[PDB]
Amino acid sequence: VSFSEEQEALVLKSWAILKKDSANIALRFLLKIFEVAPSASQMFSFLRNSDVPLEKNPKLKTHAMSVFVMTCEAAAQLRKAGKVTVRDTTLKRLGATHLKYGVGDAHFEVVKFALLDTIKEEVPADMWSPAMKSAWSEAYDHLVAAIKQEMKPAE
Amino acid sequence: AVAVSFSEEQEALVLKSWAILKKDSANIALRFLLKIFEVAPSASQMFSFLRNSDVPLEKNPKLKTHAMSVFVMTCEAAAQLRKAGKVTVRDTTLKRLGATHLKYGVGDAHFEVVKFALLDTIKEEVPADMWSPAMKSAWSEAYDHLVAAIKQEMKPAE
Ligand code: HEM
Ligand code: HEM
């Protein structure tokens, strides 16, 4: 896996834009998943805030952030070491949770799709490219693959 | 029972939009197929590899035939909900659909992704003057009900 500094930079600087506006963007991201695959949003709770009808669960925002943060971290690792180097304790845990809630390939792929959609939508038209798309995809795909190694018996 | 409300208007919306797709069928099918692969590569990959050994998504007859089915059967479900008040897929045909999809690991997310792609195709291919939220909802209702029937034969009658 050759993951260049340029590719990493595409991920970092695009993320820096989503971070500046993380509350509004997280909600658009969540509602995108709900649009594509309502059953994914079902794996969590329903509804809870300050007497609000919106889709504002705390755990949904936190999870959204985790996906983006860890994928970004994963970009960093591919550059530095050419592989995902997340703590083996963290990987076992991620493994166990996702298998417990019955997350399959379809779910990981829906989230990938909504993640890329969100980035394209939120960053300026001239920052976006197939190169940006592939930089994020590669990182995500490598992170998902490592989690899945811990979702099945000793290879 | 589940309260059916499928109208003549809804059926008409499905049918005339269906007529539009058939003027550019091969190309529309291919775009629908690339939508699925874009959202859920795995969904697409269930349609095999060795027996034909045809690499490309673009070449797979199973894929083209399957797309045709999703659309055609959904149209019929429109017509059936309107006339009969329910999906009237003959029962051997229905048991066979439930078997085949259970056999290939098809779950709720898969059914939703296909709906997502079907609605995309509908919005992308029909003229902006023609398209409306009502048109989207008519397709969704017909599709949802067809899926509800197939799923009944994918779980214990229990
Ligand atoms: C790269 C992708 C993803 C990352 C990095 C990620 C990360 C996480 C993390 C850090 C947690 C906290 C749970 C724990 O570790 O104790 C979590 C929980 C969870 N994740 Fe993911 N996740 C990913 C994809 C998905 C997908 C695709 C789904 C479902 C469509 C999903 C469903 C869940 C569920 C249901 C929980 C449990 C949350 C709860 O207890 O309410 N995750 N995920
Ligand atoms: C309203 C929705 C759908 C309809 C009407 C439909 C209809 C069909 C039909 C008629 C067959 C013919 C095989 C047989 O049973 O003899 C079939 C096969 C199959 N379908 Fe579906 N399907 C639907 C949704 C899905 C979804 C969501 C998936 C997966 C993402 C899927 C995956 C398959 C697979 C893998 C086969 C077997 C391949 C083959 O033998 O050709 N289908 N479907």
Curated annotation (Swiss-Prot), chain A:
Protein's cellular compartments: Cytoplasm; Nucleus
Q: Where is this site: Homodimerization?
A: 133
Q: Specify the effect of residue 110 to N.
A: Prevents subunit association, but has little effect on ligand binding
EC number(s) recorded for this UniProt protein: 1.7.2.-
Which cofactors are reported in the record for this sequence?
A: heme b
CDD domains linked: class1_nsHb-like
Gene Ontology MF: a single term: oxidoreductase activity
Catalysed reaction(s) here are: Fe(III)-heme b-[protein] + nitric oxide + H2O = Fe(II)-heme b-[protein] + nitrite + 2 H(+)
Q: Which GO terms describe its biological process?
A: response to nitrate; response to nitric oxide; response to nitrite
PROSITE patterns in the record: GLOBIN (PS01033), PLANT_GLOBIN (PS00208)
Q: Main location per UniProt? A: cytoplasm
Record keyword Iron present: yes
**Amino acids binding heme b:** 45, 59, 63, 93, 97-98
Q: What induces it?
A: By flooding and etiolating but not by oxidative, nitrosative or hormonal stresses. Strong, rapid and transient induction by nitrate NO(3)(-), nitrite NO(2)(-) and nitric oxide (NO) donors, such as S-nitroso-N-acetylpenicillamine (SNAP) and sodium nitroprusside (SNP).
Name the domain of life this protein comes from.
Eukaryota
Family (UniProt): Belongs to the plant globin family.
This molecule's function is given as: Phytoglobin that reduces nitrite to nitric oxide under anoxic conditions (e.g. during flooding or in waterlogged soil). May not function as an oxygen storage or transport protein. Has an unusually high affinity for O(2) through a hexacoordinate heme iron because of a very low dissociation constant.
Q: Matching PANTHER family, A to Z?
A: LEGHEMOGLOBIN-RELATED, NON-SYMBIOTIC HEMOGLOBIN 3
- Recorded protein name is Anaerobic nitrite reductase NSHB1
Give the originating organism.
Oryza sativa subsp. japonica (Rice)
Q: Which gene encodes it?
A: NSHB1
Swiss-Prot record, chain B:
Note describing how the cofactor binds:
Binds 1 heme group per subunit.
Activity regulation here?
Slowly reduced by ascorbic acid (AA); this reaction may become a source of nitric oxide (NO) during hypoxia.
Keyword annotations for this protein, in alphabetical order, are:
Cytoplasm, Heme, Iron, Metal-binding, Nucleus, Oxidoreductase
Q: In which tissues is it expressed?
A: Expressed in coleoptiles, embryos, leaves, seminal roots and roots.
Q: Which InterPro entries match?
A: Globin, Globin-like_sf, Globin/Proto, Leghaemoglobin-like, Leghaemoglobin_Fe_BS
Q: Is Chaperone there in the keyword field?
A: no
Residues at site: Homodimerization? 136
- Residue numbers of motif Homodimerization? 38-42, 108-120
Q: Which GO terms describe its molecular function?
A: heme binding; metal ion binding; oxidoreductase activity; oxygen binding
What result is annotated for mutating residue 112 to V? Prevents subunit association, but has little effect on ligand binding
Report if keyword Metal-binding is assigned: yes
The positions making up the signal sequence are none
Outcome of altering residue 42 to A? Prevents subunit association, but has little effect on ligand binding
What does the entry say induces or represses the expression of this protein?
Answer: By flooding and etiolating but not by oxidative, nitrosative or hormonal stresses. Strong, rapid and transient induction by nitrate NO(3)(-), nitrite NO(2)(-) and nitric oxide (NO) donors, such as S-nitroso-N-acetylpenicillamine (SNAP) and sodium nitroprusside (SNP).
Task: Say what the protein does.
Answer: Phytoglobin that reduces nitrite to nitric oxide under anoxic conditions (e.g. during flooding or in waterlogged soil). May not function as an oxygen storage or transport protein. Has an unusually high affinity for O(2) through a hexacoordinate heme iron because of a very low dissociation constant.
| UniProt subunit comment | Homodimer.
Protein name, UniProt field = Anaerobic nitrite reductase NSHB1
Which species is the source of this protein? Oryza sativa subsp. japonica (Rice)
